[PDB]
A paper describes a structure:
The isolated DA1472 variant is a double point mutation variant, N151G and L259V. The mode of binding of NADH in the active site, including the nicotinamide moiety, is well defined by the electron density map, being the same in both structures. The structures of the protein regions with the mutated residues are well defined by the electron density maps and the conformations of these regions are the same as in the wild-type. The comparison of the structures of the active sites of the wild-type and the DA1472 variant shows that the shorter side chains of the L259V (valine instead of leucine) and N151G (glycine instead of asparagine) amino acid substitutions provide more space in the region where the substrate binds. The structural data show that the two amino acid changes (N151G and L259V) do not cause any change of main-chain conformation, but do provide more space in the substrate-binding groove. Also, the geometry of the catalytic site is not affected and the enzymological data suggest that the reaction mechanism of the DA1472 variant is also the same. The results illustrate a dramatic shift in substrate scope. The preference of the wild-type enzyme for short-chain aliphatic 2-hy­droxy­aldehydes has been shifted to favor aryl-substituted, non-hydroxy­lated aldehydes. k cat/K M for phenyl­acetaldehyde (compound 3) has increased approximately 9000-fold whereas the activity with the native (S)-lactaldehyde (compound 2) has decreased approximately 80-fold.
Here it is shown which structural adaptations were introduced by directed evolution experiments that changed the catalytic properties of the Escherichia coli (E. coli) (S)-lactaldehyde reductase [EC 1.1.1.77]. This enzyme, referred to as FucO, is also known as an Fe2+, NAD+-dependent group-III alcohol de­hydrogenase and is involved in the catabolism of rare sugars in E. coli.
Author numbering:
A (entry chain BBB), B (entry chain AAA): 3 to 385
The structure:
Amino acid sequence: ANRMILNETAWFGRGAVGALTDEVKRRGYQKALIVTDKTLVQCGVVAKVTDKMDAAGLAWAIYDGVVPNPTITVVKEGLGVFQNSGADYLIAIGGGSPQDTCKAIGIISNNPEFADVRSLEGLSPTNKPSVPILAIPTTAGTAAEVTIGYVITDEEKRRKFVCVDPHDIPQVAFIDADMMDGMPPALKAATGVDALTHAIEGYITRGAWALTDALHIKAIEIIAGALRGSVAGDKDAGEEMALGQYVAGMGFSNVGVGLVHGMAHPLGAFYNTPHGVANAILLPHVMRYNADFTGEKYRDIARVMGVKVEGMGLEEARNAAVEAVFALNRDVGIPPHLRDVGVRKEDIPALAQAALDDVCTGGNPREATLEDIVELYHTAWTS
Amino acid sequence: ANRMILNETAWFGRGAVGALTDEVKRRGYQKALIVTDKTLVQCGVVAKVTDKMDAAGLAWAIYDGVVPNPTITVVKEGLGVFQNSGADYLIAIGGGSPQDTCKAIGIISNNPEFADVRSLEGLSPTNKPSVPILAIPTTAGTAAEVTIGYVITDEEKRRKFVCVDPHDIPQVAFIDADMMDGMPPALKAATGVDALTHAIEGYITRGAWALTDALHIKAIEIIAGALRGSVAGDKDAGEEMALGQYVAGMGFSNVGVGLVHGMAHPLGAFYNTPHGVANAILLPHVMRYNADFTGEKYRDIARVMGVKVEGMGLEEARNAAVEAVFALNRDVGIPPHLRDVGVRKEDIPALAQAALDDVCTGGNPREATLEDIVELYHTAWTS
Ligand SMILES: NC(=O)C1=CN([C@@H]2O[C@H](COP(=O)(O)OP(=O)(O)OC[C@H]3O[C@@H](n4cnc5c(N)ncnc54)[C@H](O)[C@@H]3O)[C@@H](O)[C@H]2O)C=CC1
Ligand SMILES: NC(=O)C1=CN([C@@H]2O[C@H](COP(=O)(O)OP(=O)(O)OC[C@H]3O[C@@H](n4cnc5c(N)ncnc54)[C@H](O)[C@@H]3O)[C@@H](O)[C@H]2O)C=CC1
Ligand SMILES: [Fe+3]
Ligand SMILES: [Fe+3]
């Protein structure tokens, strides 16, 4: 049997954070800890929420110490703030980094034996649900608001580790493009191809089944249709991306991804490479590696990405899907090589071992060896 | 902004009730009231759940007094059992009737100011969540396990009233075709076209948007592909129908349906007509009435119902969709006229007024007058 964890309550569309004060009142919560970063405070994005909260007379404190690729230290700092704040719920405002941080705080806060943070890794044997989380994405996106995974950086060990826990699922997600319009184009592009990577790896993952297939192929269609326009600054394209990134989550959270996420995590841990950029560069190279274990599914990808696949045989359609992703990466200004974003040749053997041992690699529809991952990094390295 | 209420946790596939004992233990519940009917006790379908529960050492009581089109009297009997049982949670085993009954008991049981049952009608202003509900459908189906609506019969007033409450959403749904194989073919057919009706009315409802559209058109595809085979007794067709009926719910619960449900509720209340059979007879007639306010959407329906649309104008495609539903109704043995299932000509004026006042009618993409609903019943009535 296949399990689906989803958000019990989700609000979709420009103005969706408009619903938050009434959700909080109907739930009887008394005080929020908002988990976010200095940038979203600075740019006035957190204020879009706190202004409404203040107008409704709802108490909030704020932790803004989250850094991209959130570390064990960030989780413990935020945990310390929550525990002294008196908060009875959490509001995650940000991308993956604040949202994963918020999941770790919420879990540890109702399961205090996990406050070392490392022991949460894998299928966390938590007894209690997370402190309730209201999740507000500001990137488009990691789909953190609807996934049961969160990823934390162990600095001492130089590795991103995955915590998977149904207890961490947010009680409400607010998917509101107003909260996303301030993303620089490069951030829209990087988080866009992240979303696309989720949808494409979810579509072809070992555990894929009819429902996740339907969700994933619709998310690829929405993302491929909207990203160029969103990066260009189109309003409706921004709103489409907010939805597409989410729908991808509904799928990949429940069945997994593959070697792209597997190979992107070591780059995060070694170099602090943004997750989306690492995914964007690796995606077409890994799709080429996977092509022969994906049945007719690349034909579907090619079609929804606007390639005329009528008549074109399966081998040509598989290549047109890989090329449509190369073309998207170029069109939205993602650098094409790992060397352009600070990766070192010398590190590839160690990166490849960490990629092979990454839990996300298990979902890849083609069995990867150390030497295959070594070769793949070398292919993404430089011309 | 658009809201989605879904199941936080759902298990899909043959053997899905296999997960119930683990879900109960993880949740720390002490004692279930199972809400069901004498038929599912008699046919040994309840035992498929209680045998696993007994093997896991889990306490259960049982209320088996639910009748099709569950009355106020059934809700109060079940309420009385729950309140004296000591149960801390509910397991709904059945079709719409036990599942809607279980939602009413769960709500009333944590919201004692609604125990008259009539006051729950509409957007019930409940303060408290329902007693937690684990939902196990045995028909394919009403999608009750995932909807926020429930429908109760006021015998004295001769009317089905709709209660809409996010507090009633089941904590976990187990969608397990093993629990559905015992349905007589006529019940598979009647609940099948119910599922199809939900998906088609959801697809064209006034509140329809991108997410519900994707869910609905995928559910029409699954249902139209599997129903004939399921009615014939095909195993995999049965499993497909279990999924399709659910996916339809994920949509229509969150945006609504239309005039088919609106006109079927009076038949329930006047005659105790099965819901699905009334939906099946009315569906193609209402679809023809709606055709011109459905954009390109009947062309989508025609395609996924296996009509060759390659070089077909939208007018012809709209008619082929109406005809594909007539053809399905014939092939699965649904009587074609309202007169064949015990409706009276003399009642049509009163039925039409009750249909017009039914809250479900509001979603219809074409504004219905009394005269239009009168005419529609007359069209479905006889040769
Ligand atoms: N929880 C899960 O299931 C998943 C986890 N992840 C994790 O998510 C993280 C990546 O999160 P992302 O959203 O890609 O970025 P992020 O949350 O790391 O943020 C990147 C940077 O963009 C800035 N930023 C974010 N939103 C902005 C906005 N609206 N306007 C202006 N600046 C803004 C932030 O302040 C930050 O400096 C990684 O740690 C990755 O491992 C990725 C996918 C799935
Ligand atoms: N909750 C919601 O949002 C919705 C509500 N409904 C409600 O659902 C009700 C109709 O529910 P249905 O599921 O169509 O039927 P039902 O639950 O009323 O049952 C119909 C008959 O079939 C029998 N049966 C059910 N499963 C069986 C199985 N596996 N094997 C043998 N016999 C079986 C039952 O014992 C019963 O006698 C109506 O009262 C309607 O208003 C309908 C759809 C949506
Ligand atoms: Fe990702
Ligand atoms: Fe129905």
